[PDB]
Amino acid sequence: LNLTKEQHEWLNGWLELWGAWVYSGRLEKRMSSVIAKFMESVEPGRVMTRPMCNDDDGMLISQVVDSVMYIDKKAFGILLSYYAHGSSKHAIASYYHRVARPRKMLCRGGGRIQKPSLATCRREVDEILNASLFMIYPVLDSAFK
């Protein structure tokens, strides 16, 4: 399943506020290590094109996201690539198509070990994004309420 429409836009807006918060570099580096090794591949003098949230609410959003997404680094990397840096979904899917190993395909390759197409790459990064938001949402209500 997935979320409803109002919950999707609410979580999307809160995550881009949180992404504009971490994009300045105001996250303390001892708190987590995956954002620490994500934010080292970007210049320190970044520009601010998005509205930025305040300190402790962004601290609350950062602590809940690395408490629920501390088991995997790939889906968390997609999340920081879409929301923190601000890259679009199509660029993420194009780079994942240009990198990923040959996989077994069903109902179109007949089991042939081949590279994934761009359409299934867009579909799997959309599924990864929707699954990460479904892991974010009820634990975020548990942190808020």
Partner DNA sequence: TCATTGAGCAAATGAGCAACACTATTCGCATATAATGGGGTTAGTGACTCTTAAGT
- CA dist 52 and 16 (Å) reads 9
Shortest gap between Cβ of 117 and DNA (angstroms)?
3
Of residues 41, 108, 111, 145, which one binds DNA by CB under 7 A?
108
- CA dist 28 and 31 (Å) reads 6
In the bound state with DNA, the residue whose beta carbon lies nearer, of 86 and 138, is 86
Shortest gap between Cβ of 24 and DNA (angstroms)?
21
Is residue 142 at the binding interface for DNA, with CB under 7 A as the rule?
Answer: no
In 22-38, which positions are buried (b, 16+ CB within 10 angstroms) versus exposed (e)? bbeeebeeeebeebeeb
How many residues lie near DNA (CB under 7 A)?
A: 14
Shortest gap between Cβ of 103 and DNA (angstroms)?
7
Contact (Cβ atoms closer than 8 angstroms) between residue 139 and residue 70: no
Of residues 36, 42, 91, 119, which one binds DNA by CB under 7 A?
119
Contact (Cβ atoms closer than 8 angstroms) between residue 136 and residue 68: yes
Of residues 48, 71, 99, 107, which one binds DNA by CB under 7 A?
107
Q: Residue 73: name the closest of 42, 123, 45, 38 by CA.
A: 38
Name residues contacting DNA, limited to 121-140 (CB under 7 A). 122-124
- Give the interface with DNA as residue ranges (CB under 7 A): 105-109, 114, 116-120, 122-124
